[PDB]
Amino acid sequence: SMQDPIADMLTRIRNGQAANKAAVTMPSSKLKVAIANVLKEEGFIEDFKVEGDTKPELELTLKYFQGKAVVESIQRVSRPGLRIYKRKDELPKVMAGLGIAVVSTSKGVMTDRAARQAGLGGEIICYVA
Amino acid sequence: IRTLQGRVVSDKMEKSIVVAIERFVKHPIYGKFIKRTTKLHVHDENNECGIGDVVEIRECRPLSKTKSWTLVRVVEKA
Amino acid sequence: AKEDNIEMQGTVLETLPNTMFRVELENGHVVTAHISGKMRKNYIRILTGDKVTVELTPYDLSKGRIVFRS
Amino acid sequence: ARYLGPKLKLSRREGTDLFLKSGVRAIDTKCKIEQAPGQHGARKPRLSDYGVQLREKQKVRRIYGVLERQFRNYYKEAARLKGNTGENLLALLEGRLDNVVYRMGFGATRAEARQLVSHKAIMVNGRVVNIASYQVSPNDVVSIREKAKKQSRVKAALELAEQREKPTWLEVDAGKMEGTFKRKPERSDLSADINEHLIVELYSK
Amino acid sequence: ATVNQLVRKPRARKVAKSNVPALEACPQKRGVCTRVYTTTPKKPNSALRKVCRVRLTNGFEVTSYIGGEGHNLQEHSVILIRGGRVKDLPGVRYHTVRGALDCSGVKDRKQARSKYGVKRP
Amino acid sequence: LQEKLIAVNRVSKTVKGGRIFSFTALTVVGDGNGRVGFGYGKAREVPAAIQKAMEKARRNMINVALNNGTLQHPVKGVHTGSRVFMQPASEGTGIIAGGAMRAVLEVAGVHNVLAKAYGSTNPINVVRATIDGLENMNSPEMVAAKRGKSVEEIL
RNA sequence: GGUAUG
């Protein structure tokens, strides 16, 4: 059964990019939307929208640059089978700073850079080189 | 002040209950968070608890071979 | 610089696996002998019954190298 | 504990003057510097990458007259010190009293220097120091002792140093027969023929 | 292996056997020669290699190679054995130490003397 | 261009007669400033094999976006059964690498790098893994460009 | 119809 919706979201992005799809779409959730925002604001996706009310659908718009896909890598880190939390001082650097770790802190989901500046640890959702 | 909360798993002793405390701890090697359980023999003066209740307990002087904890309060009933 | 070998004459009694032979010497001791390298490479076949020269060692008088077949 | 063998063999093996003779006479006039020592010297074989690393290491050792255990410790120190391991290594070797006494021109060869130091003819900041390995620090004053200023070999050695390029990081009064280790040398101040990265690679294997 | 499986059953080390069990983690052992013979090697090689069967102080009984040209060992000689297989002799895991106890040094040897128990000329 | 011979191997086909031996040469060439190519040449004799490899290497050179004689970030390369890991190092580290990786990194002009080859260490595959890894290495500039950011916002 | 072995 479906036991990791975030991993599903990341896989839709990874797979959508490899298929050169313009948009991908999925069942929405607060957290998926939270992650989409971080992706948008770091410029790994162009845009996103939640349409619908009873069964909301998240729709990410994917970015390409000189034909190639902008999201080179996107791996789930913390997962249901094995959760990963890091303190402020031991937050991961993805691609020596050139990528993001998306972190869930007590002040909401943000990049590892943002969590370092706030002085917050939290759950490592994913890497996005 | 220093208390543990946990769940009664036996009441078949006079004035005594077994209480299972549940801890969630990161595995030293593999990093997975594992549920682990401590079972304490507890002192229950008035036999007020029964199996399934959630109880607050505090450490105290020895009271028997196996009891060094005493019931503070019953938090939830079965 | 090597120590000297006793060359003794003898008769092959049985052929054993992998060019090993029982050989009764003149003195009457039955050594387990093996074919020389030179003979192996030059395809000199040894048989039951054959007359053979056996190089021996003082270190072990149960063993020898067949060096010549008559 | 020291190499007491023929000096020019070492040069001939490395294929370079390691400055193991005074320099009163050119090295080609004393030995076939092109040709490696021994009966099979003439046939120049291709070295492996290990061989290249090795002969680099051995060049530096033989220059400075340091055996392998002491040399390896220099490497370990140079690696511990902050900055560039290879650079540090050459700085340490340059620090050695025997080297300094040579680079000041009190000894003809680094071995003569070593004998001066060993025989209690050298003072650092007024005190006698008979240890070739002694690390001279910035602003130290290396000097000949009163007793050994009347040694003909010291006079001769100073003449020979004038012929060589004078080190900048040292400053010698030839008349007083004393000198000042002003600073540690920079990599640039030492000879560029030494490829210290090979040595660091060698010790990382 | 999933995490959960490793939590339940952790990764196990390969339990590494010694190649020299008779030594019982000693650098050498003393023994008495019960037999001193020769043996032919495995396929490609050809020789009569000098060996001895030796009973050690710890009761183990082993075969030990006798290296060098020529030896003085008999039955009942007291020798020191050390580790070291001989590739072409099945079941020979030990070498005899030349120039220790009853085993003599090799005569007239001038190179690798220390390996064959021979004093400097 | 620097030029390095990594490996020479004698191969053979069988024929009615007996065996026809021939030679293979694996080489890398690079400018010492983040251009590097490899070539693999075959011939009946080694020098011709090497020459063919050098010719092929010269025409098949990639660009690698270096950063002051080291890598931009950690990289993983894979080819066939050869997995290679390379990370940036400090000045004076040197090339800490094994063999086929070293050649590629030398001639590309990587002065300081830590590297490790896992899996198969067949030179022909390790070289491909290494160069693969280098060719997919992102600089700060091209990351900023793809993400629609400036280099300062990235860094 | 079994093509034992140069």
Add this chain to the structure above:
RNA sequence: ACUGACGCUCAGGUGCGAAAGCGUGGGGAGCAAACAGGAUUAGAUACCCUGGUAGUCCACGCCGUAAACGAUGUCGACUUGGAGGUUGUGCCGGCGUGGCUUCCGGAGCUAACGCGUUAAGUCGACCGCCUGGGGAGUACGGCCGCAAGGUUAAAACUCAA
């Protein structure tokens, strides 16, 4: 239309499980281990021929194994196509839309062969299993079995594959 996360996986457990085989009792055309004879051959404990018993069939009970194979664990999601088959269904022979299934092939994956929306691709959950060859699926012990045996399962040693 209804319930409202009631789900997925599953050590141990429980059951089902080709054929041969075993027990008791039926049945017995054809076929056929064993066996008898006839040949073939250097021999021919075979292949070939003539026969032929157990067995093959039934009932009940046991056994629990097979190249029990897709040599591919179960569940869920995602990711270009082409040609078929089969079974529903909607709409006007055509145009859709579901289920199962055969073949080819793209990206990708793979040591390669190949796999390729029924993945061996991209991911997530849980379980089972591997760690050089031989020794050995053997020994010992336990459990199961009327037995045949099955299951769990080593080591010494030897080889440099």
Add this chain to the structure above:
RNA sequence: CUAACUCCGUGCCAGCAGCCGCGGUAAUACGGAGGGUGCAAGCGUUAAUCGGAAUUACUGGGCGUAAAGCGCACGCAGGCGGUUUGUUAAGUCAGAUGUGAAAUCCCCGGGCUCAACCUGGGAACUGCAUCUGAUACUGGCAAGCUUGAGUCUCGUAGAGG
């Protein structure tokens, strides 16, 4: 491999050997010699541990054919769990306090002529406990929701038993 080659003796013998291998007449591989390489008051050998070994793979591996998917199912414990709101604050995160002996390691110094050694101060001791906060995520509790999973209605095909 691995820095360093010749002659003579021997002739798959004697012997070498960590592995690959060498030795059967012109052996850079055995023994001696000359020459050379490496170490040096040591040098070799053996033993033993970690490394290289991503060869037990948490970091960091595999299972179609290389070793590896239970013959197949159901299913208890266990592991994992769609979506919204509230609440809780167990996990998690933050700050602080206590503690984490000294020695050792590391850093910056100081002393023995130097070094080893000795030594001042620091850092570290990745931990544990407590208190005070944060509340995104996970867990708990409460209430929901319908997209997972089911039930009902009508019908269809099928060597399912």
